[PDB]
Design a protein around this motif. Structure first.
Motif, PDB file in Angstrom:
ATOM      1  N   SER A 115      41.870 -24.678 -36.045  1.00 33.61           N
ATOM      2  CA  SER A 115      41.451 -23.475 -36.784  1.00 33.61           C
ATOM      3  C   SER A 115      41.062 -22.400 -35.789  1.00 33.61           C
ATOM      4  CB  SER A 115      40.238 -23.788 -37.648  1.00 33.61           C
ATOM      5  OG  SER A 115      39.191 -24.316 -36.843  1.00 33.61           O
ATOM      6  N   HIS A 116      40.294 -22.823 -34.775  1.00 30.59           N
ATOM      7  CA  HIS A 116      39.993 -22.006 -33.613  1.00 30.59           C
ATOM      8  C   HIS A 116      39.480 -22.898 -32.482  1.00 30.59           C
ATOM      9  CE1 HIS A 116      36.351 -22.501 -35.921  1.00 30.59           C
ATOM     10  NE2 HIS A 116      35.587 -21.809 -35.086  1.00 30.59           N
ATOM     11  N   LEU A 117      39.189 -22.313 -31.313  1.00 35.13           N
ATOM     12  CA  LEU A 117      38.875 -23.128 -30.153  1.00 35.13           C
ATOM     13  C   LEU A 117      37.375 -23.180 -29.785  1.00 35.13           C
ATOM     14  CD1 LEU A 117      42.003 -22.233 -27.973  1.00 35.13           C
ATOM     15  CD2 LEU A 117      41.624 -24.264 -29.465  1.00 35.13           C
ATOM     16  N   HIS A 118      36.492 -22.876 -30.747  1.00 33.15           N
ATOM     17  CA  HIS A 118      35.060 -23.061 -30.515  1.00 33.15           C
ATOM     18  C   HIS A 118      34.779 -24.533 -30.223  1.00 33.15           C
ATOM     19  CE1 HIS A 118      33.526 -19.261 -32.869  1.00 33.15           C
ATOM     20  NE2 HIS A 118      33.963 -18.962 -31.655  1.00 33.15           N
ATOM     21  N   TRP A 119      33.676 -24.780 -29.519  1.00 37.14           N
ATOM     22  CA  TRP A 119      33.308 -26.103 -28.997  1.00 37.14           C
ATOM     23  C   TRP A 119      33.231 -27.204 -30.093  1.00 37.14           C
ATOM     24  CZ3 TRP A 119      28.904 -29.089 -29.829  1.00 37.14           C
ATOM     25  CH2 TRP A 119      28.050 -28.555 -30.809  1.00 37.14           C
ATOM     26  N   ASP A 120      32.952 -26.812 -31.330  1.00 39.98           N
ATOM     27  CA  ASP A 120      32.742 -27.801 -32.404  1.00 39.98           C
ATOM     28  C   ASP A 120      34.036 -28.059 -33.204  1.00 39.98           C
ATOM     29  OD1 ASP A 120      32.110 -25.047 -33.180  1.00 39.98           O
ATOM     30  OD2 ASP A 120      31.534 -25.806 -35.178  1.00 39.98           O
ATOM     31  N   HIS A 121      35.144 -27.443 -32.768  1.00 40.77           N
ATOM     32  CA  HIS A 121      36.435 -27.542 -33.462  1.00 40.77           C
ATOM     33  C   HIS A 121      37.562 -28.020 -32.555  1.00 40.77           C
ATOM     34  CE1 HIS A 121      34.987 -25.534 -37.154  1.00 40.77           C
ATOM     35  NE2 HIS A 121      34.123 -25.009 -36.300  1.00 40.77           N
ATOM     36  N   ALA A 122      37.421 -27.815 -31.239  1.00 43.48           N
ATOM     37  CA  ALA A 122      38.471 -28.169 -30.293  1.00 43.48           C
ATOM     38  C   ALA A 122      37.973 -29.053 -29.118  1.00 43.48           C
ATOM     39  CB  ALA A 122      39.177 -26.863 -29.761  1.00 43.48           C
ATOM     40  N   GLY A 147      37.978 -12.837 -36.895  1.00 40.31           N
ATOM     41  CA  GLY A 147      36.663 -12.261 -37.139  1.00 40.31           C
ATOM     42  C   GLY A 147      35.548 -13.146 -36.636  1.00 40.31           C
ATOM     43  N   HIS A 148      35.403 -14.328 -37.235  1.00 37.49           N
ATOM     44  CA  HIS A 148      34.431 -15.275 -36.719  1.00 37.49           C
ATOM     45  C   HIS A 148      34.774 -15.562 -35.261  1.00 37.49           C
ATOM     46  CE1 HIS A 148      32.010 -18.870 -36.157  1.00 37.49           C
ATOM     47  NE2 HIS A 148      33.106 -19.554 -35.875  1.00 37.49           N
ATOM     48  N   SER A 149      36.077 -15.718 -34.982  1.00 35.35           N
ATOM     49  CA  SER A 149      36.587 -15.747 -33.591  1.00 35.35           C
ATOM     50  C   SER A 149      37.838 -14.856 -33.562  1.00 35.35           C
ATOM     51  CB  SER A 149      36.915 -17.169 -33.112  1.00 35.35           C
ATOM     52  OG  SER A 149      38.028 -17.725 -33.830  1.00 35.35           O
ATOM     53  N   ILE A 176      37.453 -22.895 -43.416  1.00 35.00           N
ATOM     54  CA  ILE A 176      36.924 -23.207 -42.120  1.00 35.00           C
ATOM     55  C   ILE A 176      35.821 -22.213 -41.856  1.00 35.00           C
ATOM     56  CG2 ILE A 176      37.422 -23.979 -39.822  1.00 35.00           C
ATOM     57  CD1 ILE A 176      39.191 -25.339 -41.797  1.00 35.00           C
ATOM     58  N   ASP A 177      35.801 -21.598 -40.686  1.00 33.11           N
ATOM     59  CA  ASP A 177      34.669 -20.732 -40.325  1.00 33.11           C
ATOM     60  C   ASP A 177      34.856 -19.248 -40.694  1.00 33.11           C
ATOM     61  OD1 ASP A 177      33.465 -23.074 -39.535  1.00 33.11           O
ATOM     62  OD2 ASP A 177      33.210 -22.542 -37.396  1.00 33.11           O
ATOM     63  N   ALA A 178      35.858 -18.952 -41.529  1.00 34.74           N
ATOM     64  CA  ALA A 178      35.999 -17.618 -42.074  1.00 34.74           C
ATOM     65  C   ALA A 178      34.853 -17.395 -43.094  1.00 34.74           C
ATOM     66  CB  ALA A 178      37.407 -17.422 -42.692  1.00 34.74           C
ATOM     67  N   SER A 179      34.220 -18.492 -43.513  1.00 39.68           N
ATOM     68  CA  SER A 179      32.876 -18.471 -44.129  1.00 39.68           C
ATOM     69  C   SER A 179      32.161 -19.773 -43.892  1.00 39.68           C
ATOM     70  CB  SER A 179      32.962 -18.221 -45.632  1.00 39.68           C
ATOM     71  OG  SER A 179      33.000 -16.824 -45.850  1.00 39.68           O
ATOM     72  N   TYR A 180      31.004 -19.719 -43.222  1.00 43.40           N
ATOM     73  CA  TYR A 180      30.197 -20.934 -43.044  1.00 43.40           C
ATOM     74  C   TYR A 180      29.754 -21.545 -44.370  1.00 43.40           C
ATOM     75  CZ  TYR A 180      29.292 -20.661 -37.993  1.00 43.40           C
ATOM     76  OH  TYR A 180      29.380 -20.651 -36.622  1.00 43.40           O
ATOM     77  N   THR A 181      29.303 -20.670 -45.273  1.00 44.75           N
ATOM     78  CA  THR A 181      28.696 -21.076 -46.557  1.00 44.75           C
ATOM     79  C   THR A 181      29.251 -20.316 -47.744  1.00 44.75           C
ATOM     80  OG1 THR A 181      26.911 -19.419 -46.557  1.00 44.75           O
ATOM     81  CG2 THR A 181      26.559 -21.446 -45.347  1.00 44.75           C
TER      82      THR A 181
END
Ligand SMILES: [Zn+2]
Ligand SMILES: [Zn+2]
Length: 250
Positions: free
Chosen positions: A103-110, A168-170, A190-195
Motif C-alpha cells: 500500500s505504501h513503504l512506511h515501516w509498519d507496512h513494508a 496524501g498520507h504518503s 489502508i492508511d488513506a484513512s486511519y479511522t
C-alpha cells in the motif's frame, strides 16, 4: 471474476500518540493500534497485501529511541508477528506468493519486504521515489534489489483486485477495491484513512500532505457512492472489535 477469500491478518500492534488519528489533538495519551496485513486467495494464486513491521521491532519497544520520533512510536511485535511466521501459519512460504502489494513503504507496512526476493512487489512510482530519500523511511522498507513491479496510478492486479491511487498520507499511497465471492465489493482504505471518522468526517490525521489526503478521501467517496462497498480502515481500534480475522475470511 471474484476473489475466493480475503483474510484480515493481525500483524502485531503499535503505540502512537492520539494526535496521529486526529491532527487537531494535543499529545500525551497513548493508543495501542492494530497493524494489519491481508491475504487474497485468487484463481491466479495468493496475493499478500503489506508485510508488517521490520525484524528490528521484535521485542523492541525502544526501536525509535534516539531518533526524531522517540517516544511517539513504540512497536508491539513478537516473534510470531514476523511476516514469514505469519505466512507459515496461513500455510505459505514467500516464494509461494503470486504478488506482494505494498500500500505504501512506511515501516509498519513494508518492514517485511526483504523476505520476498523473487515475488514481484507492486508499489507506486511516487512512493518508491519518495522512499529513496525521505527521512520517515527505514532501510528495511526500500531494499534496492527486490523484484519491484513499479506502477503509476490506478491498476488492475488480477480480476477482482483493483488498486486505487490515494496519495496524501504518503506520497504514493494506494488503497484496494476487491470483489470477493462471499461479500461482494470491499474497500480497504489502508492508511488513506486511519479511522472511520478520518473518512466519513474528514478529520485530519497523520500524513505527508493533508490537502492531497483529503482529495484522495473525496475520490474514495465517489467510488463508495457508486459501488456501495463495505469499508475497512487502516488503524481503527473501534472497527477492529467487530472485524472477522484469520482463520475466518470475507
Ligand atoms: Zn502509513
Ligand atoms: Zn500504517
Amino acid at each position: 471474476m471474484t476473489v475466493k477469500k480475503l483474510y484480515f491478518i493481525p500483524a502485531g500492534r503499535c503505540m502512537l500518540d492520539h494526535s496521529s488519528v486526529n491532527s487537531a489533538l494535543t499529545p500525551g495519551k497513548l493508543l495501542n493500534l492494530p497493524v494489519w496485513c491481508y491475504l487474497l486467495e485468487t484463481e491466479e494464486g495468493p496475493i499478500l497485501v503489506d508485510t508488517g513491521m521490520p525484524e528490528s521491532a521484535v521485542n523492541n519497544e525502544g526501536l525509535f529511541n534516539g531518533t526524531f520520533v522517540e517516544g511517539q512510536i513504540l512497536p508491539k511485535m513478537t516473534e510470531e508477528d514476523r511476516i514469514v511466521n505469519i505466512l507459515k501459519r496461513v500455510g505459505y512460504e514467500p516464494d509461494d506468493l503470486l504478488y506482494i502489494i505494498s500500500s505504501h513503504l512506511h515501516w509498519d507496512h513494508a518492514g517485511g519486504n526483504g523476505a520476498f526476493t523473487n515475488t514481484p512487489i507492486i508499489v507506486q512510482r511516487t512512493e518508491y521515489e519518495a522512499a529513496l530519500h525521505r527521512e520517515e523511511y527505514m532501510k528495511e522498507c526500500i531494499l534496492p534489489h527486490l523484484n519491484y513491479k513499479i506502477i503509476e496510478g490506478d491498476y488492475e492486479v488480477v480480476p477482482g483486485v483493483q488498486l486505487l491511487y490515494t496519495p496524501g498520507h504518503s506520497p504514493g499511497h494506494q488503497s484496494l477495491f476487491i470483489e470477493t465471492e462471499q461479500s461482494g465489493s470491499v474497500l480497504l482504505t489502508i492508511d488513506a484513512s486511519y479511522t472511520k471518522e478520518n473518512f466519513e468526517d474528514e478529520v485530519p490525521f497523520a500524513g505527508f500532505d493533508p490537502e492531497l489526503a483529503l482529495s484522495s478521501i473525496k475520490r474514495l467517496k465517489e467510488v463508495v457512492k457508486k459501488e456501495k462497498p463495505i469499508i475497512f480502515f487502516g488503524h481503527d481500534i473501534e472497527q477492529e472489535k467487530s472485524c472477522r480475522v484469520f482463520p475466518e475470511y470475507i
